[PDB]
Scaffold this active site. Structure first.
Site, PDB file in Angstrom:
ATOM      1  N   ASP A 274       0.805  -1.196   0.000  1.00 37.50           N
ATOM      2  CA  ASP A 274       0.000   0.000   0.000  1.00 37.50           C
ATOM      3  C   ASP A 274       0.847   1.259   0.000  1.00 37.50           C
ATOM      4  O   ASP A 274       1.953   1.256   0.530  1.00 37.50           O
ATOM      5  CB  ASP A 274      -0.847   0.021   1.268  1.00 37.50           C
ATOM      6  CG  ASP A 274      -2.238   0.474   1.014  1.00 37.50           C
ATOM      7  OD1 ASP A 274      -2.530   0.898  -0.125  1.00 37.50           O
ATOM      8  OD2 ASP A 274      -3.058   0.410   1.962  1.00 37.50           O
TER       9      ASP A 274
ATOM     10  N   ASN B 103      -8.846  -2.201  -7.232  1.00 39.27           N
ATOM     11  CA  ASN B 103      -7.942  -1.458  -8.118  1.00 39.27           C
ATOM     12  C   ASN B 103      -8.445  -1.414  -9.551  1.00 39.27           C
ATOM     13  O   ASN B 103      -8.140  -0.488 -10.296  1.00 39.27           O
ATOM     14  CB  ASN B 103      -6.548  -2.097  -8.183  1.00 39.27           C
ATOM     15  CG  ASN B 103      -5.794  -2.078  -6.851  1.00 39.27           C
ATOM     16  OD1 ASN B 103      -4.935  -2.934  -6.621  1.00 39.27           O
ATOM     17  ND2 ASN B 103      -6.078  -1.096  -5.993  1.00 39.27           N
TER      18      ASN B 103
HETATM   19  C1  LIG Z   1       3.869  -2.766  -8.564  1.00 42.73           C
HETATM   20  C2  LIG Z   1       3.012  -2.546  -7.320  1.00 42.73           C
HETATM   21  C3  LIG Z   1       3.696  -2.068  -6.026  1.00 42.73           C
HETATM   22  C4  LIG Z   1       1.636  -2.801  -7.405  1.00 42.73           C
HETATM   23  C5  LIG Z   1       0.622  -2.677  -6.447  1.00 42.73           C
HETATM   24  C6  LIG Z   1      -0.592  -1.957  -7.077  1.00 42.73           C
HETATM   25  C7  LIG Z   1      -1.823  -1.785  -6.158  1.00 42.73           C
HETATM   26  C8  LIG Z   1      -2.036  -2.982  -5.213  1.00 42.73           C
HETATM   27  C9  LIG Z   1      -1.694  -0.473  -5.373  1.00 42.73           C
HETATM   28  C10 LIG Z   1      -2.861   0.504  -5.635  1.00 42.73           C
HETATM   29  O1  LIG Z   1      -2.433   1.866  -5.343  1.00 42.73           O
HETATM   30  P1  LIG Z   1      -2.026   2.230  -3.917  1.00 42.73           P
HETATM   31  O2  LIG Z   1      -3.142   1.662  -2.987  1.00 42.73           O
HETATM   32  O3  LIG Z   1      -0.673   1.659  -3.520  1.00 42.73           O
HETATM   33  O4  LIG Z   1      -1.956   3.860  -3.802  1.00 42.73           O
HETATM   34  P2  LIG Z   1      -2.314   4.503  -2.385  1.00 42.73           P
HETATM   35  O5  LIG Z   1      -2.362   3.412  -1.363  1.00 42.73           O
HETATM   36  O6  LIG Z   1      -1.340   5.533  -1.978  1.00 42.73           O
HETATM   37  O7  LIG Z   1      -3.668   5.127  -2.627  1.00 42.73           O
END
Ligand SMILES: CC(C)=CCC/C(C)=C\COP(=O)(O)OP(=O)(O)O
Ligand SMILES: CC(C)=CCC/C(C)=C/COP(=O)(O)OP(=O)(O)O
EC number: 2.5.1.68
Lengths: 227, 227
Positions: free
Chosen positions: A11, A60
């Site tokens: 995350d 996602n």
């Molecule tokens: C190559 C990688 C690391 C893939 C993981 C993608 C996904 C699980 C993360 C979604 O965005 P996010 O939730 O990380 O953004 P934020 O939490 O900041 O909103």
């Protein structure tokens, strides 16, 4: 003292990118992808038997099409790196590649299929995954098999067991996660390996995933050992 | 802001007793029981709509018989107090009373049945509860209803849905937990409200359950609100 199976929810990639001043959050995903590669190396070298990394949730998949496409490309690159033959890691997809588009699905499947079934280190890549959905799909698979075996309707009503569900998850035949790591200070749950993690140790850090360090991994293992 | 449903795992009763120099750790359970009653009062007064308290897991039922006997009596007292007419709380058993013995089961059921169906505050008492088992029993109930409605075996294979499972758990008709409180520094999951807590906020204190105070409850609500 040591987990057999560590699961990681990655995350904070977008928050990381924003904090760093990037307008394009894919900078976050790309750094997170680098950290996935690092983390798996740490796990292998620490003698962890199985690592599951949460790459793409069903949540996602609801996001902006263009951003989502870019993310899926980064994920496909990640998996292709995980599946590099020099690693000699055994890899499994956990989730529904029917949700990510056919070209990425082909590339992912091709990479994962190229890996040995038998290895010292195993990696699960969770893509197009949801925990409640997984359980439902396990039950459907279980019942489908029983029907094929000549089960009656009333037998199907009684066929479902705890063990039958476990055997029909994506993670069939694998040890449950001993330790689940989540970053970005998130202490919510998000259904990741919902069934399998019922008795797992949870470990949290405030650091966003792209900022996760080898010393944070060391702390996780130290905390796990202490418990 | 305020959780609609708080779930509480009352960990650390024995450890608290041991730490405070009590030879007989049943005493921890008695102190913990007093704390359950107080916690529920705090929840009611704070405007929380539903609280679930973990009283007895399917694991807990494999303790030493003297300890288990004391625990079961104490749990029965706890439930009788929760069900006291003066509270006007609506109570539901979450779990299988067939696992605690006929006489305690009789007392627990009598108490719970005596409570109003409609009330401003609701309490789930989790006794003889296991989360994976709950899901299996939900799926069986689901399929049984489908069969009763005339479904063929073919149709049963595909009858299970996420909503179908939720609707057939012990907690049917109730909101999932928003906040799960864990004490004694425990961050290890225990299958408690396994399906329902997929997306719950988790909150931890080092305080053992019998040491849990209103100031800690206030901290949990603050931390919840700030997340
Ligand atoms: C190559 C990688 C690391 C893939 C993981 C993608 C996904 C699980 C993360 C979604 O965005 P996010 O939730 O990380 O953004 P934020 O939490 O900041 O909103
Ligand atoms: C009347 C009460 C409070 C009932 C709850 C019972 C449940 C929380 C387990 C009791 O053992 P324990 O796990 O709390 O002891 P310890 O965690 O210290 O080993």
């Amino acid at each position: 003292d040591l987990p057999r199976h560590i699961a990681v929810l990655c995350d904070g990639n977008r928050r990381w990118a924003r904090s760093a001043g990037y307008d394009d959050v894919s900078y976050g995903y790309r750094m997170g992808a680098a950290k996935i590669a690092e983390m798996l190396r740490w796990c292998h070298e620490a003698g962890i038997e199985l690592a599951t990394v949460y790459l793409l949730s069903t949540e996602n998949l609801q996001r902006d099409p263009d951003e989502l496409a870019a993310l899926i490309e980064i994920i496909t690159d990640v998996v292709e790196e995980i599946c590099a033959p020099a690693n000699h890691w055994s890899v499994r997809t956990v989730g529904d590649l029917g949700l990510i588009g056919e070209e990425p699905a082909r590339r992912l499947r091709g990479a994962v299929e190229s890996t040995p079934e038998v290895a010292s280190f195993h990696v699960n890549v969770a893509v197009g995954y949801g925990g409640r959905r997984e359980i439902v799909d396990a039950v459907r698979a279980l019942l489908s098999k029983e029907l094929a075996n000549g089960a009656t309707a009333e037998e199907l009503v009684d066929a479902v067991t705890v063990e039958g569900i476990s055997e029909n998850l994506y993670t069939s035949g694998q040890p449950d996660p001993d330790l689940v790591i989540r970053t970005s200070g998130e202490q919510r749950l998000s259904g990741f390996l919902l069934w399998q993690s019922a008795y797992s140790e949870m470990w949290f850090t405030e650091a966003h995933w792209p900022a996760f360090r080898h010393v944070d991994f060391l702390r996780a293992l130290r905390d796990y050992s202490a418990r």
